[PDB]
Every structure is written in structure tokens, then in C-alpha cells.
Design a protein around this ligand. Structure first.
Ligand SMILES: Cc1cc2nc3c(=O)[nH]c(=O)nc-3n(C[C@H](O)[C@H](O)[C@H](O)COP(=O)(O)O)c2cc1C
Ligand SMILES: Cc1cc2nc3c(=O)[nH]c(=O)nc-3n(C[C@H](O)[C@H](O)[C@H](O)COP(=O)(O)O)c2cc1C
Lengths: 122, 122
């Protein structure tokens, strides 16, 4: 499951980055630390407004990478830390995963990331 | 050259993300908003400590993507904004580009991104 420090980062606002495999190279989109909803410590839910290219990419290769951090949380060499998350992505338009982000009216779906690994990179 | 709102984002701390193309798939690493230096309005310089897999990917394909933002800066439709930057990357161990981040004594090199396009995505 995700470590306590990961949740500490989530107590602070920040920019989350999500990389996927495009056909002409990688693609990169974002979300906010404050938007992420974690289910039972091993699945991360992201509210999807756009992410059309991203969804197309996931349909071809479900592997995704996600990073996030906060200068307000202690890392391993002083103030500031973050994580590199590797996992498989899936889009849902119903179910408890969607309900987790349904609060966001502009959300057309939920991007569900099943975490395989989490590395504190700083 | 880079827009006004982009430079505003740079004055607030945050997590910058850099995506590259790996032989296996995409790769994603980070730096801090406060570490970025812009030279001549179209070249973003990043202090490199690690970024080894990143450097290897750039050697195979110089095209990279960078995202960054801040909740403290006015967005298109509300508080909070960010950008998707597309450009070509090069690692420098000397020259004015390296000197641009020499302040960081731990920097083994400078990752210079010559911006092709910048898009306010939020
Ligand atoms: C700081 C920041 C936060 C964002 N948060 C979201 C979000 O929660 N949901 C979303 O669909 N797009 C969000 N976006 C926009 C995406 O990054 C992306 O530009 C957009 O969804 C289009 O995705 P696509 O390029 O995969 O089609 C955000 C952008 C920024 C800069
Ligand atoms: C919030 C945050 C900021 C980071 N800033 C830097 C940085 O300025 N320079 C750097 O070389 N690595 C930085 N890292 C570590 C990189 O993201 C990456 O893990 C490391 O350089 C190894 O790169 P590689 O996976 O390409 O080999 C940061 C990590 C986090 C979570």
C-alpha cells in the first residue's frame, strides 16, 4: 500500500503529472494534489474532464506513470519530497470509482490507476 | 517566447514534470518550479543531479514534454493554471547554459529545453 509520506504530500496542493505512451512519443497531462482520491491505499482516482488523447493512449497501452510532491513535506535530504508512481490505468464512467470523483461536475469519467509501485524519488 | 502567466507560475513553488521517450515506454522525472531558469525567453534550464535514464532517452530522442503550474495563479476559468511545454532537450556540462545553474553545487549538468510550443492547459 502507499506510504504515509505519500498521504502527507496529498495534504498539500500541487501539480500531479500523468504520462502515457502516445503514437508519436509520450504524452503528459496533469491534475491537482487536492483532486486525487485514493481507494484502500492502492488505487488512485483522478477526475477526468478532458484527457481525450490520454484515454486513447491508455486504450492502446494501459501503463502510466504519475509524479507528485510538495516542498512542505520532508524528503530524505531535507525539506521537499515527491514520488514516481507506476501503474495500470483504466477509465470508468460508473461504479464506486466514478462516485469517488463524481463531486466534480465537469467530470466525464474517472481515471483509475492501479498502483504497481511507488518510489520516493526525493 | 514564453507568456506572462508562465513566468507568474515560476514565482510560486511547485513540482515540474519532464517526460521523455524510453525504449520500453515513457519516462517521467521532476524538478522544482523555483529551480527553473529561462534563457532568452525560449530556453528552459534545469539543474541536473540524477536524470540518468532521462539523459539516455534524450540521446535517443531529443523531443520532451514538460508540465508545471500553480494553484496560486489565475487560470482560464478560475484560480489555478498550468502549461504543457513541448521542446527539444540537450544536456550541457559547460558553457553559459551550464553556468545558468552553477549555483546548484550538486548539479552534474544542465538540461536545456529549447521550447517549440507552450500551451496553457488550465
Ligand atoms: C495544474 C493542472 C491541473 C489539471 N487538472 C485536470 C483534471 O483534474 N482533469 C482533467 O481532465 N484535466 C486536467 N488538466 C488538463 C489536462 O492536463 C489536459 O491538458 C487535458 O485534460 C487534455 O488532455 P489530453 O491532452 O489527454 O486530451 C489540468 C491541467 C493543469 C495544468
Ligand atoms: C519534487 C521533486 C523534485 C526533483 N527535482 C530534481 C532536480 O531538480 N534535479 C534532478 O536531477 N532530479 C530531481 N528529482 C529526481 C528526479 O525526478 C529523478 O527521480 C532522478 O533525477 C533520476 O532520474 P532518472 O530516473 O531519469 O534516472 C526530483 C524529484 C522530485 C519528487
Amino acid at each position: 500500500m502507499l506510504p504515509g509520506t505519500f498521504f502527507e504530500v496529498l495534504k498539500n496542493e500541487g501539480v500531479v503529472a500523468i504520462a502515457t505512451q502516445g503514437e508519436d512519443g509520450p504524452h503528459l497531462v496533469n491534475t491537482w494534489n487536492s483532486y486525487l482520491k485514493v481507494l484502500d491505499g492502492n488505487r488512485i482516482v483522478v477526475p477526468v474532464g478532458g484527457m481525450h488523447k490520454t484515454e486513447a493512449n491508455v486504450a492502446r497501452d494501459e501503463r502510466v506513470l504519475m509524479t507528485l510532491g510538495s516542498r512542505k513535506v520532508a524528503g530524505r535530504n531535507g525539506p521537499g519530497t515527491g514520488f514516481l508512481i507506476r501503474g495500470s490505468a483504466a477509465f470508468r464512467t460508473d461504479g464506486p470509482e466514478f462516485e469517488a470523483i463524481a463531486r466534480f461536475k465537469w467530470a466525464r469519467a474517472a481515471l483509475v490507476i492501479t498502483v504497481v509501485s511507488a518510489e520516493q524519488t526525493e
